[PDB]
Amino acid sequence: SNEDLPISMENPYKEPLKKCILCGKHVDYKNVQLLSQFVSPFTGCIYGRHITGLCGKKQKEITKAIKRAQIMGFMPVTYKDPAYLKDPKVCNIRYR
Amino acid sequence: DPPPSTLLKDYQNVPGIEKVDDVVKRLLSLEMANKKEMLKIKQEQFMKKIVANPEDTRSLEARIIALSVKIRSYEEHLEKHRKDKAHKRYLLMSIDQRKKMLKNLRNTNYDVFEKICWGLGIEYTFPP
Amino acid sequence: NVESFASMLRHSPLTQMGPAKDKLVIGRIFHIVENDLYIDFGGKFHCVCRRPEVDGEKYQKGTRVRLRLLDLELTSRFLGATTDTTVLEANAVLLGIQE
Amino acid sequence: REVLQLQEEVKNFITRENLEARVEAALDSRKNYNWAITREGLVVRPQR
Amino acid sequence: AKHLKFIARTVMVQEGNVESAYRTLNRILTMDGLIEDIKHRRYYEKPCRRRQRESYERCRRIYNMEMARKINFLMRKNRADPWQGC
Amino acid sequence: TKFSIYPPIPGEESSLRWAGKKFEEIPIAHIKASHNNTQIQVVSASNEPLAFASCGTEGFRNAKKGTGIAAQTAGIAAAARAKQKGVIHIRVVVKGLGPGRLSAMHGLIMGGLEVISITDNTPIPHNGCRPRKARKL
Amino acid sequence: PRYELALILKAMQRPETAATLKRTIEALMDRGAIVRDLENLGERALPYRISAHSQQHNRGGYFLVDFYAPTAAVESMVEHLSRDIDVIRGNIVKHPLTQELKECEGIVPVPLAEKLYSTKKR
Amino acid sequence: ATPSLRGRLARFGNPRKPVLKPNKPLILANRVGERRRATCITEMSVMMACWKQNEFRDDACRKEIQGFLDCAARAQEARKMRSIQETLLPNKLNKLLQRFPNKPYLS
RNA sequence: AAACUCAGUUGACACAAAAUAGACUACGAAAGUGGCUUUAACAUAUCUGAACACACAAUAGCUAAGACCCAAACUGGGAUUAGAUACCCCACUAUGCUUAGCCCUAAACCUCAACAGUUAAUCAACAAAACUGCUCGCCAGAACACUACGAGCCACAGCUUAAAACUCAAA
Ligand code: FES
Ligand SMILES: [Mg+2]
Ligand SMILES: [Mg+2]
Ligand SMILES: [Mg+2]
Ligand SMILES: [Mg+2]
Ligand SMILES: [Mg+2]
Ligand SMILES: [Mg+2]
Ligand SMILES: [Mg+2]
Ligand SMILES: [Mg+2]
């Protein structure tokens, strides 16, 4: 009938759905190095998702892993292990 | 309860499963599986023993068999957790639902209803 | 053989352009107020950029410049609003002058 | 395939026979489960 | 108690400006929520009051974030009136 | 090396020194800024008591104790005692959000002692015990 | 099912460590487990002091025992670990590798909630 | 990113119990809140301690007294400069919001 | 003021409670549930369906046996006040905790019933937009009255069901 009329399709220009840094990666309570990347260096508090930039599922995984490691003796509770203070910062917190 | 040596429902039909190590067989047996797998084995046994089409699950007979296995699981659970009010409620609700299913089956297909009652040991008592 | 609205829309440069994000367009300063340059770039709206500190005098009415578009229109919905609030102007970055 | 892979793995399972050997091998070796993540989501395995 | 000392909540003073060190430590505690937590734990906040306060704070944060978004969105339109007079 | 707000880690080989001593060997000036009283005890690296000073012990009484001025007085007295007992640099550890929290450090410095680290050890239970009921005035 | 026993043992020499590991694996096998693998995570300073069997511990040797055991054996193994005196702290968990990584396409956003209030002028 | 408001309030079509119970409607107002409102006590303390140990004879406390006086003058100057500096402002922001008001109704 | 001569550091140490995550909004029928691990486990392939039964039902409370850090009705002391049987401070008990039974009430409220559907021609006001179909429950001026009587119940100063008379033109 008419070829210039718009066609029914999806959005070919759709930008990729942003993926959390941990998407597709296995959060384990033994990976204390990864877990310490989401705990405050000074108080040991677990950062919120507004700081970690994690999806809900990965935030819950991180929290459960941190608690399990802390109670199983893999991770300090009140502070970040000093061995990991110099790891790639991935948290949107600026104390100074 | 099926013997602990029984295989899981998914592996009972894999070819050559009789030519694997005793360790592999024990890994795939009900001994190294939770109670849900044992309940599934019970359910398949009952379906084979009663229903005319063991491969059909949407039928009311299959529904009654599955619900009876669930009721047995709840009764076993409450034998040990006597103060589990949530599972007591689930058990009573499941008994009521099985009564309703049996009522419908009795009204529709009586011979199948008798077969179900005999197989599952259910006595269909009329409501007061 | 008269072009229809469908044909015109299909073959228009704006339609040929995809999303207006990070697209280099040629704007034309049509109004200047202090260091604010109102630039029209063929969209429905204009972009109000700031006279670059370098070559500032070179930016005068009618000057044709290069913009990197970020949004044809600056609109967004806010808590409780039933319809988008629009500031009636595009978003673009002034990359310099076209010669 | 699951059972096939399981049969392969069962050969390596610790048993009452190869128990001292496996215990000593474990004492000798060291498994490291740590690995950091960068802002770009690239694993950073530690250097040992 | 069972942890190592002088690692948690410890800041090092630079060039002797203990005031700057204490400001940094206070910022750390406030951002981590320890100051507010201590103030609230001084007296027992009954669960219903705690829930009401949490809900009120959540609503306040939503409203403030939305208002800040609106302000930042409209801030560009604080330019000089281009069509003055007409 | 560049200045880092994080304290040096025990066991780790560090070049930082104060009066020829490592961080783990510096004396510790425990401050306790209660709601209405500031206490200050300076102990050695091996928890050997050296000095003590409190707003109450400084002659302040009743509400006067819970003020910044009383905290400064206590800090100055503790600093003087520690100085005469052989203390130059101190790691300050304060547990309490009372009015004397910072004034105690100010006095502890004005009395001579230099501070190298400020530690907050305010006991923050992860719930645990139940605090007293709220006040209706 | 598949369990993983994270086992922090008292810091001791190699002969005693091997004896303790052999005893623990023996207890698992007696209870009916299939010890699939043993992994040494390396001796390290515990994150916090642990007081097990009236003895304070600041360092310990970390191990993982990946096994398959019947569900009824976990409680007995936990009791045996508690009785054992060379174990600073033992914990049996479900093996993480059994759990499957559900695919996440991306972080789908939540648009601003709409029509929470009537459109009447107030 | 603002916290989600989907399924938070008690509404029809919301099976779950409310997450939030806002006393006022969560609708942006066309205005923002108004700007909500000792100094140099250490020099005073120094001067007063010197007075206490000297019997309040300013002759030998001159330095501390001059410091205290200069600090008070600086405090007044700081008050003046802060006032003039204070004088985005809530008034201007309210003008902007009036220009772009929130429309919680239809038209 | 009264109170204690107990207070600071360090080390050992719960049958109590469960920072941060949580700016998540999930699970459960509701009450409820936010430390860790494991086991068991989250009824119904059609919906509605209890004053007509079965099973639950926070806190408080009763009975008996234990625990007791802290909190804490009552009580005692200090202070305030015209008084202060309160508010404020201190001490401490029942009680909060575990076990086995009871008790069966909440502003048990999201005051918005279950199921299915619609967004079209709006809609007293406010609140959380307006409705359609179907089903059960409930309501018919206020107060008397979460009352009396009767009945049932492990309840004995109780709970559930629940009136009438007199009164008023209002509520
Ligand atoms: S972004 Fe993919 S799981 Fe979070
Ligand atoms: Mg029904
Ligand atoms: Mg009912
Ligand atoms: Mg009850
Ligand atoms: Mg008691
Ligand atoms: Mg409620
Ligand atoms: Mg009542
Ligand atoms: Mg009655
Ligand atoms: Mg009666």
Side-chain angles (χ1 to χ4, degrees), chain A residues 40 42-43 77-78 93 95, chain E residues 3 8-9 27 31-32 34:
Chain A
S40 170
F42 306 93
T43 53
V77 191
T78 53
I93 203 73
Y95 293 113
Chain E
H3 281 90
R9 312 191 230 173
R27 282 200 299 281
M31 292 170 70
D32 288 5
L34 277 66

Side-chain angles (χ1 to χ4, degrees), chain E residues 10-42:
Chain E
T10 300
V11 173
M12 300 293 277
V13 71
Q14 198 187 351
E15 301 174 352
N17 55 4
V18 301
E19 203 64 279
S20 181
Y22 185 78
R23 280 195 307 262
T24 299
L25 183 80
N26 181 288
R27 282 200 299 281
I28 288 156
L29 302 189
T30 302
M31 292 170 70
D32 288 5
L34 277 66
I35 300 304
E36 277 291 328
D37 169 84
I38 298 152
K39 286 187 294 196
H40 283 134
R41 282 172 180 290
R42 184 170 182 183

Side-chain angles (χ1 to χ4, degrees), chain B residues 21-36:
Chain B
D21 187 356
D22 289 331
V23 170
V24 170
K25 294 175 74 173
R26 185 174 59 185
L27 286 171
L28 304 190
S29 78
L30 294 176
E31 179 183 355
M32 308 301 218
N34 60 7
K35 201 177 174 245
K36 295 285 173 66

